[PDB]
């Protein structure tokens, strides 16, 4: 690139205008993007905005790891374990059994054990197009209760089949994250308590540190009135 | 640098699933010195990533952004730390204000006296902690210190 743009926020208004393009000229914007992208990169599904993005595990009806039947497609009536979701598109990438496309790929992105440039790759698919399985497929799932998961380490909801709430579709237990990194502090030290609220006389963090912690010349923090000030103000 | 590498590969980097930024609650029960150390470690990490990120963007013209994401995450932890530092000071100030109101302070002292002091079924240890907590008396001189001494004398007389 030879840019330097990344070390600053210059031409901010222009960037905002470009970034927040009007939605009725979104086809115009993306037409040229589509053209630019090669076949193996580009996706058919609409790149949804971060507002309309499934952040919660309730918003996603399915998690990476669970088993799902595909429908409304070429590879329909096919069971597939969903591998990973795409965040920008609001869609899932399925395993080998799911929907795919055969596309030419350069030798930069060649897998070990390839004869041809042609490679089959999995297309993204929406949560609307595929239904759960348990063999019995599920029409729709609803969430009514919640609980702390041991493996996920989150207060996740209970996936219950729509109609009869007692038939729980359980979450897929994820792979064990064997953490061995120098930049992650271990559980014992991460949580060990070294502070206690003890003193009322001595303040906990020093007076010379305050200017870093908060702006002492803050235009927002208005001063309170006094009697003398009132008297001065009023005729 | 990190392990004397010109650039951390994808394998050399810490993976996203294994890594989490600090929680504000977790930070809240850490000492000042510890927090300061953590902050400086974060800053160091950012510098390492910033060097690398710059190289990636300026020279090779990449859009891989793992380093950038890491830097952002670190920045998040840093501001959370900054927030908890401010919050602690504010809490202290509020406590001071509360104590300054005389009746409330008196009530608090009475409550302290009733439950744990002057009771049976340790006391010295409580007093030493209480001394530090409420007055300027460790094991230098002020009106507050004098008041604490007087209170201690009163407690002794009672007991």
């Amino acid at each position: 690139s030879g840019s330097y743009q990344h070390l600053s926020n210059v031409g901010s208004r222009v960037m905002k205008r470009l970034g927040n393009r009007p939605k009725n000229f979104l086809p115009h914007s993306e037409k040229f993007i589509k053209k630019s992208t090669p076949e193996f990169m580009k996706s058919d599904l609409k790149e949804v905005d971060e507002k309309t993005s499934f952040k919660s595990e309730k918003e996603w009806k399915f998690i990476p790891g669970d088993r799902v039947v595909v429908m409304s497609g070429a590879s329909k009536g096919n069971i597939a374990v969903i591998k990973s979701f795409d965040k920008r598109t609001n869609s899932f990438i399925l395993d080998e059994n799911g929907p795919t496309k055969t596309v030419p790929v350069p030798k930069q992105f060649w897998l070990e054990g390839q004869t041809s440039h042609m490679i089959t790759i999995p297309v993204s698919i929406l949560g609307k197009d595929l239904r759960l399985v348990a063999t019995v497929a599920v029409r729709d799932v609803s969430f009514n209760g919640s609980y702390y998961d041991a493996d996920y380490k989150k207060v996740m909801p209970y996936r219950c089949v729509k109609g009869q709430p007692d038939l729980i579709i359980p979450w897929p237990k994820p792979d064990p994250i064997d953490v061995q990194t120098n930049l992650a502090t271990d559980p014992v030290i991460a949580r060990e308590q070294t502070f206690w609220v003890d003193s009322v006389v001595r303040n906990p963090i020093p007076k010379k540190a305050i200017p870093s912690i908060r702006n002492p010349h803050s235009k927002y923090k208005r001063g309170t009135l006094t009697a003398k000030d009132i008297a001065k103000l009023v005729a | 640098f990190s392990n004397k590498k010109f650039i951390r590969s994808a394998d050399d980097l810490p993976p996203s699933s294994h890594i989490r930024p600090w929680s504000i609650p977790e930070l809240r029960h850490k000492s000042f010195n510890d927090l300061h150390s953590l902050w400086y470690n974060c800053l160091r990490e950012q510098n390492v990533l910033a060097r690398e990120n710059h190289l990636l963007k300026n020279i090779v013209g990449s859009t891989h952004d793992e380093f950038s994401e890491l830097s952002n995450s670190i920045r998040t932890t840093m501001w959370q730390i900054r927030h908890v530092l401010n919050e602690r000071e504010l809490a202290y100030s509020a406590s001071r204000e509360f104590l300054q109101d005389e009746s409330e302070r008196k009530k608090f002292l009475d409550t302290l006296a009733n439950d744990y002091f002057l009771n049976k079924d340790e006391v010295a240890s409580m007093l030493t902690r209480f001394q530090l907590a409420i007055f300027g008396i460790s094991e230098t001189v002020d009106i507050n210190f004098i008041d604490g001494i007087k209170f201690l004398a009163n407690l002794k007389l009672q007991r």
Partner: peptide
């Protein structure tokens, strides 16, 4: 999406 898939494939190959 493709890039992420490719990365996953590489990881699988490695392990």
């Amino acid at each position: 999406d493709f890039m992420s898939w490719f990365k996953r494939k590489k990881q699988e190959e490695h392990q």
